[PDB]
């Protein structure tokens, strides 16, 4: 299992504009387009993102390209962020994937806000951090994905995803 397969499981693939869990216009593999309520704004963003007139629809190839971009942007954001880098550096390979997943889903700023959890992972206090991470809007809003993530930090293996 790798970060791309892991995220593909969590986000799915859609080749037409759709609303995400929060109601925002997204496409492909969890690629947010705009928070704007306007479908048109969405389609504009989309064409700018692909480089073509897409009329709200893209190909598999295009979805994967945007996916490649997002994953890279996620990793590089972690590396540049002063609160995230040290955690990432302290982590093993699986847990590193886990953090990347979170950052792809909630942005750098988002994850950087989980001060106590970060501290806990950093200290390798797995069970404590799992309990703190669950106390969040995040967990309450997407509990099945959050539980997958939390279990992954807990065990340090891909079990939660070998099911799926």
From the number of C-beta atoms within 10 Å of its C-beta (0-12, 13-18, 19+), residue 137 rates as exposed
Q: How far is CA 29 from CA 49, 65, 157, in A?
A: 14, 10, 23
62 noted as active-site residue? no
**Would you give the DSSP letter of residue 57?**
B
**Would you give the DSSP letter of residue 113?**
T
d(CA 136, CA 111): 11
The number of folded domains in the chain is: 1
Pull the structure tokens for residue 136: 């969040």
Its domain, for residue 132, covers 1-164
Do 129 and 153 contact (CB within 8 A), yes or no? Answer: yes
d(CA 129, CA 65): 34
From 56, 54, 74, 87, select the one nearest 11 (Cα to Cα): 74
Which residues in the chain belong to E strands, given as ranges? Answer: 14-19, 25-28, 31-34
- Method by which the coordinates were obtained: X-ray
Pull the structure tokens for residue 153: 């930090």
Q: Which of 20, 47, 64, 128 is catalytic?
A: 20
Give, for 156, the enclosing helix (H) or strand (E). Answer: none
Do 94 and 157 contact (CB within 8 A), yes or no? Answer: yes
Do 84 and 112 contact (CB within 8 A), yes or no? Answer: yes
90 is in an annotated binding site: no
d(CA 117, CA 99): 11
Reduced to 3 states, what is the DSSP secondary structure of residue 118?
Answer: helix
- Residue 86: beta bridge partners? none
67 is in an annotated binding site: no
Reduced to 3 states, what is the DSSP secondary structure of residue 23?
Answer: coil
What is the bridge-based pairing of β-strands 31-34 and 14-19? unpaired
40 is in an annotated binding site: no
Q: Which of 5, 10, 11, 72 is catalytic?
A: 11
Q: What is the resolution of this structure in A?
A: 1.9
101 is in an annotated binding site: no
d(CA 29, CA 44): 18
Residue 53: which CATH number?
1.10.530.40
């Amino acid at each position: 299992m790798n970060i791309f397969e892991m995220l593909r499981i969590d986000e799915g693939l859609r080749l037409k504009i759709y609303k995400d869990t929060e109601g925002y216009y997204t496409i492909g593999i969890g690629h947010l387009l705009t928070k704007s309520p306007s479908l048109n704004a969405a389609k504009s963003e989309l064409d700018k993102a692909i480089g073509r007139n897409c009329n709200g629809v893209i190909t598999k190839d295009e979805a994967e390209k945007l996916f490649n971009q997002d994953v890279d942007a996620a990793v590089r954001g972690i590396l540049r962020n002063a609160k995230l880098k040290p955690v990432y550096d302290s982590l093993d390979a699986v847990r590193r994937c886990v953090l990347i997943n979170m950052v792809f889903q909630m942005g750098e700023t988002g994850v950087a806000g989980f001060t106590n959890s970060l501290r806990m992972l950093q200290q390798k206090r797995w069970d404590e951090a799992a309990v703190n991470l669950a106390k969040s809007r995040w967990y309450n809003q997407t509990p099945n994905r959050a539980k997958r993530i939390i279990t992954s930090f807990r065990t340090g293996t891909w079990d939660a995803y070998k099911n799926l």
